Design a protein around this ligand. Sequence first.
Ligand SMILES: O=C(O)c1cc(Br)ccc1N[C@@H]1CCCNC1
Ligand SMILES: O=C(O)c1cc(Br)ccc1N[C@@H]1CCCNC1
Ligand SMILES: O=C([O-])c1cc(Br)ccc1N[C@H]1CCCNC1
Lengths: 156, 156
Amino acid sequence: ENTSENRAQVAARQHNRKIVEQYMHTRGEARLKRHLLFTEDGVGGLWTTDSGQPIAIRGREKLGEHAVWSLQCFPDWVWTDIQIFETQDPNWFWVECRGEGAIVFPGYPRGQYRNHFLHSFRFENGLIKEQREFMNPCEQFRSLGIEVPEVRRDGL
Amino acid sequence: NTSENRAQVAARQHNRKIVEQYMHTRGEARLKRHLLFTEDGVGGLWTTDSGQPIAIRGREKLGEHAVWSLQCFPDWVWTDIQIFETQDPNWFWVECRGEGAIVFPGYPRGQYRNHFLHSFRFENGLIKEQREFMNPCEQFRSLGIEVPEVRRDGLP
Ligand SMILES: O=C(O)c1cc(Br)ccc1N[C@@H]1CCCNC1
Ligand SMILES: O=C(O)c1cc(Br)ccc1N[C@@H]1CCCNC1
Ligand SMILES: O=C([O-])c1cc(Br)ccc1N[C@H]1CCCNC1
């Protein structure tokens, strides 16, 4: 039905989608200002790590500080093949994409990192309250020259 | 309130019940879950140590692979299930946890727990593509397989 509440849900979803689009297309020096898309207390980070616990960066200003690190470690990163999924919750989106770029971690050789990624984006008052990245850490191991453990799958 | 929109709302409602049934299937019922798929439907694991998916193609193959997975994961349960509808009535995402005994040939019996994202694409009210995304490092741990530790220097 065309009710005021349905219209507000649509307007919210439309505004939030634009912010996900902006986030996913932010490159180069603009990455240093991407934290401004978050709530003051917004969280972002990497939910799939070798330790099994997330690396969560808490707060808009922490996210900005971290972005200085990221731009060194991934100096030319781009997201590609971006597919944005709206959900029944106008404040929750998922993205499936790929990503490629140089990886420059201290203690490892410089390499070329490519992966497939899923991102979750939760909004509040039109700003990102929680962003989470999910990927396969094994691909990042390969990019760093770290030997990837193998699972034998007998009888599969 | 057009019949196009009405067709889509029903498609989505129907597909969501299929996703619910899939996610709640346990025990011997797992032997018949393949019946939820199109004849040519594909299921499998998109996040693997090799970087390549383990794609199980076809309803009959899916039913055959269920026999092996009921040996390897005899008491598997999905929990904490959150279903996400999308703008496509034939595309859903699920975020959930899962755990169970892991009983692979040639590895100590373990307890495997992980966080999962599942993609479900439909055609004609059945599953045409199911894809599981997880952190393989957690499966390594469950099998006693050593997991390398990525050092993140400069990380605040
Ligand atoms: O892209 C950035 O600006 C960025 C900013 C923060 Br803060 C953390 C990580 C970042 N980028 C990496 C690229 C490789 C895949 N993981 C995310
Ligand atoms: O649960 C099933 O019946 C099942 C069926 C097929 Br065919 C393949 C794998 C299965 N289970 C594993 C459990 C641990 C996480 N990955 C999925
Ligand atoms: O490891 C998984 O969770 C898994 C997921 C999907 Br789908 C299919 C097969 C899987 N594992 C095989 C490994 C070899 C022994 N049989 C179980």
